Amino acid sequence: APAAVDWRARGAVTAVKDQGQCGSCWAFSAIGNVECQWFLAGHPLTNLSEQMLVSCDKTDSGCSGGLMNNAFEWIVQENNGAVYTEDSYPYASGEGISPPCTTSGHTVGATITGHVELPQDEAQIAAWLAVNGPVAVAVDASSWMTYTGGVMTSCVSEQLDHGVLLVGYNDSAAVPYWIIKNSWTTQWGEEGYIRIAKGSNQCLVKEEASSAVVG
Numbered sequence: 001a002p003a004a005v006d007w008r009a010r011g012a013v014t015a016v017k018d019q020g021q022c023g024s025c026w027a028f029s030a031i032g033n034v035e036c037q038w039f040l041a042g043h044p045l046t047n048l049s050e051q052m053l054v055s056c057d058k059t060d061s062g063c064s065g066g067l068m069n070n071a072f073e074w075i076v077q078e079n080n081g082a083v084y085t086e087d088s089y090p091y092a093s094g095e096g097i098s099p100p101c102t103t104s105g106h107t108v109g110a111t112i113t114g115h116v117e118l119p120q121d122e123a124q125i126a127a128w129l130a131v132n133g134p135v136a137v138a139v140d141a142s143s144w145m146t147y148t149g150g151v152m153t154s155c156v157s158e159q160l161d162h163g164v165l166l167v168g169y170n171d172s173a174a175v176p177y178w179i180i181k182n183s184w185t186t187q188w189g190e191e192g193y194i195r196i197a198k199g200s201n202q203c204l205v206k207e208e209a210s211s212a213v214v215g
């Protein structure tokens with residue numbers, strides 16, 4: 001496994017988005033993961049629809065929260081592996097109200113066949129990531145509201161409440177770090193991203209890592 005991996009440099013990651021006033025971070029985490037996997041299977045990088053999940057996935061709870069694993073399971077078992085484009089099913093829950101599910105004429109932006117879970121182990125997550133691309137992870141983000149930059153080293157690591165995307169890591173730095181894509185616009189953190197220290201389970205980053213599998 002390489003000393004550093006950044007899938008942004010390989011053009012595998014879409015622009016940072018805005019979940020707005022909605023507990024839909026689980027959908028942005030899952031969708032962001034699928035977007036990258038679709039690109040790495042050899043297809044164009046495409047914005048996909050979080051709204052599809054917030055409105056249509058009954059197993060999760062829309063703006064009230066959900067799990068990336070449930071989302072992946074829902075896509076495959078309830079939606080034929082279909083993930084819509086953001087273009088044809090745009091995000092509309094930025095204000096907290098989720099529209100009802102529609103199922104006519106939307107465009108399939110990607111097809112998945114399943115998903116895998118990763119061990120609760122940072123080195124093993126890094127090994128998978130370096131080979132297979134960005135990983136959906138859950139974090140404790142309660143100490144993230146004031147973040148403006150730098151490598152976070154004393155993150156509150158007590159309870160999972162937030163879904164994000166691991167896009168890379170750097171083991172060569174003075175303080176090794178993960179590179180994490182958030183869904184809080186580009187005004188938050190480092191141009192919408194955050195670096196947390198790697199190897200000390202900052203923000204419980206290793207506890208619930210998984211990824212969609214493309215077909």
Ligand SMILES: NC(=O)c1ccsc1NC(=O)CSc1ncn[nH]1
Pocket residue numbers: 023024025026064065066067138139160161162163
């Ligand atoms: N923002 C989120 O919804 C989110 C994102 C990551 S965790 C989490 N919390 C929940 O999904 C509530 S249901 C649950 N079941 C087991 N743990 N949590």
